[PDB]
Design a protein around this ligand. Structure first.
Ligand SMILES: O=c1ccn([C@H]2C[C@H](O)[C@@H](COP(=O)(O)NP(=O)(O)OP(=O)(O)O)O2)c(=O)[nH]1
Ligand SMILES: [Cl-]
Ligand SMILES: [Cl-]
Ligand SMILES: [Cl-]
Ligand SMILES: [Cl-]
Ligand SMILES: [Mg+2]
Ligand SMILES: [Mg+2]
Ligand code: NA
Length: 322
DNA sequence: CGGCAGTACTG
DNA sequence: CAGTAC
DNA sequence: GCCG
């Protein structure tokens, strides 16, 4: 009950504290872009706890009883109830909107955004004309609007099928699965996360590099962000009315398929919760394996096996959307 | 008092 | 390594 | 920010 990975994410669909969480999310984002990662994490978990709670919180004692809600978070909750506003919202640093603008460049995080801000930059025009940009950041800036748009899941299907058909031309036995938000059933997707493997345990070897050359040669790939080991990049379906879309690809041996599928399906906060739980049980969970701590690799032929070994009820991908 | 997921790319 | 991202 |  203290573990989100032990609960269905559909509990959030009936948020009875939206007036609270809408204001806390503003603070959470402010701490995040300013680099206060751990304070922001605490806010993120408190927001999920509030979103999934069964009733509107009405008392300081009720709030404190909720896991992920402590004294400080309770005090903020009582303020929004009594007064309808949260004073701290009127005292967020004026740098935050600009820091958010900059850190939405792919490849630029809090450290780069703060440095640019200290150098006097305030707009993407300033970044374009005056900032020093890595190769990655230049692609991010070129695709600034593209990378902030989410595509309809129907388009993600088309992208998945494009990768799959190019892969299976090399070996008809290859398996390709779109993971991430697509597999969790969301109506829109920030990118497409394609997992590739081969049931024979070995014929996945070598195809990653040939697959990319195939997709480049047919013009499907339009920019590469990372292209050693795994692929993070940019694609565009052919024809009119098409946008550049983010595409990630990972190729894994079949022996790791369940753990890779689990990792790549997420959500990110679901994974972090499941991994933290594994740690408390003397185990370690990664996209490669569930193992004992420093270790023995535990047998996980299917996703269900990972849940069972952690003592968790199985959750379909749609219920992992934390 | 100290962790807060685990891994992997770039330069 | 620090910074960034999945 | 929260929690053990
Ligand atoms: O910090 C992270 C980020 C992602 N992941 C895993 C889970 C996530 O679902 C998967 C793909 O990452 P994306 O950034 O593509 N996120 P997702 O597909 O969930 O949402 P969207 O792409 O629609 O924003 O990688 C993590 O484990 N930790
Ligand atoms: Cl939500
Ligand atoms: Cl499925
Ligand atoms: Cl290869
Ligand atoms: Cl043991
Ligand atoms: Mg995704
Ligand atoms: Mg992705
Ligand atoms: Na960024």
């Amino acid at each position: 009950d203290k573990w989100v990975c032990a609960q269905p994410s559909s509990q959030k669909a009936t948020n009875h504290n939206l007036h609270i969480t809408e204001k806390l999310e503003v603070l959470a984002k402010a701490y995040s872009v300013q680099g206060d990662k751990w304070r922001a994490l605490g806010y993120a978990k408190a927001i999920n706890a509030l979103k999934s709670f069964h009733k509107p919180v009405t008392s300081y004692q009720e709030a404190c009883s909720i896991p992920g809600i402590g004294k400080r978070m309770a005090e903020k909750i009582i303020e929004i109830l009594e007064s309808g506003h949260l004073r701290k919202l009127d005292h967020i640093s004026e740098s935050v909107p600009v820091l958010e603008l900059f850190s939405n460049i792919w490849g630029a995080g809090t450290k780069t955004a703060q440095m640019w801000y200290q150098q006097g930059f305030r707009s993407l025009e300033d970044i374009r004309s005056q900032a020093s940009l890595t190769t990655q950041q230049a692609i991010g800036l070129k695709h600034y609007s593209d990378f902030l748009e989410r595509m309809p899941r129907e388009e993600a299907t088309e992208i998945e099928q494009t990768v799959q058909k190019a892969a299976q031309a090399f070996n008809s036995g290859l398996l390709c699965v779109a993971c991430g938000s697509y597999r969790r059933g969301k109506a829109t997707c920030g990118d497409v996360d394609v997992l590739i493997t081969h049931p024979d345990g070995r014929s996945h070897r070598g195809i990653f590099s040939r697959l990319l050359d195939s997709l480049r040669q047919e013009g499907f790939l339009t920019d590469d962000l990372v292209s050693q080991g795994k692929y993070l990049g940019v694609c565009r379906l052919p024809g009119p009315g098409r946008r550049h879309r983010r595409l990630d690809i990972i190729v894994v041996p079949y022996s790791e398929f369940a753990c890779a599928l689990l990792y790549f399906t997420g959500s990110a906060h679901f994974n972090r919760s499941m991994r933290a739980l594994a740690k408390t049980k003397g185990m370690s969970l990664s996209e490669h394996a569930l193992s004992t701590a420093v270790g023995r690799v535990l047998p996980t032929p299917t996703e269900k096996d990972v849940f069972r070994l952690l003592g968790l009820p199985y959750r379909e991908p749609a219920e992992r959307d934390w």
